[PDB]
Design a protein around this ligand. Structure first.
Ligand SMILES: O=C(O)c1cc(N2C=C(CCO)NN2)cc(C(=O)O)n1
Ligand SMILES: O=C(O)c1cc(N2C=C(CCO)NN2)cc(C(=O)O)n1
Ligand SMILES: O=C(O)c1cc(N2C=C(CCO)NN2)cc(C(=O)O)n1
Ligand SMILES: [Eu+3]
Length: 207
């Protein structure tokens, strides 16, 4: 499957793509403002994620640091990124269909649109100014808006036992972005697409 990753932000981002125990394609790349990077994701990829990283430094070997979304200091991510990270999430070729969503469960750093480039389903978007409107206690000093699990480490926020409700913090994310997951047990906003669809992830789609 192809994923065209487009940075419409006025700032550079370092895109990342992983399924948690492996890179997808090269795993990461710098995208200056306006740049597009197209990756190939293997069919059947389950639990893949794409995110932006901000304020990164990498040496000539691809090792360094980012202020949001850092994946063990690598340019080319093999692992998931450090919150806060707005997440484009997908599982492909699952009994004939693809499933996509955006999640704020690991916080929000950069606005995003995640849409198919082929027919048969809608896209999803979380493009509101979550960082600017972020509740004081969730603001990340390194940049972004943390989720409450990251900040407080409670069973209720982290849904540790599979029982939790919405919270004042989850409701903030949900109000700003109704079409993204705001907590683990949120009413799903997953979109079913034809199996083997292709996609575009656009950072700062309206920004
Ligand atoms: O993002 C990480 O840091 C990470 C992700 C992991 N994984 C592994 C998967 C795939 C299936 O479990 N997903 N995330 C595992 C570990 C770790 O053991 O330290 N760490
Ligand atoms: O570098 C890692 O693999 C890593 C760093 C982690 N963290 C988490 C923090 C605190 C705030 O994010 N600092 N390092 C957590 C994990 C994991 O759970 O597998 N992995
Ligand atoms: O604590 C972690 O989350 C962790 C520790 C790791 N390791 C591995 C070693 C041994 C030698 O590198 N030390 N910490 C690796 C990972 C990861 O890949 O996600 N995560
Ligand atoms: Eu780890």
């Amino acid at each position: 499957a192809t994923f065209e990753i487009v940075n419409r932000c006025s700032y550079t981002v370092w895109a990342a793509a992983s399924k948690g125990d492996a890179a997808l394609d090269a795993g990461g790349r710098q995208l200056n403002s306006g740049e597009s990077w197209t990756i190939n994701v293997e069919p059947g990829t389950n639990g893949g994620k794409i995110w932006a990283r901000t304020d990164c430094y990498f040496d000539d070997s691809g090792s360094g640091i980012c202020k949001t979304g850092d994946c063990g200091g690598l340019l080319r991510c093999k692992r998931f990124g450090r919150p806060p990270t707005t997440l484009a999430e997908f599982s492909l070729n699952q009994y004939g269909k693809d499933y996509i969503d955006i999640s704020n469960i690991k916080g929000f750093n950069v606005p995003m649109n995640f849409s198919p480039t082929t027919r048969g389903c809608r896209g999803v978007r979380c493009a509101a100014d979550i960082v600017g409107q972020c509740p004081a206690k969730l603001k990340a000093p390194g940049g972004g808006c943390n989720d409450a699990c990251t900040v407080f480490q409670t069973s209720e926020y982290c849904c540790t036992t599979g029982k939790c409700g919405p919270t004042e913090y989850s409701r903030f994310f949900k109000r700003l972005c109704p079409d993204a997951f705001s907590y683990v047990l949120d009413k799903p906003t997953t979109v079913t697409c034809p199996g083997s669809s292709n996609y575009r992830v656009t950072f700062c789609p309206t920004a």
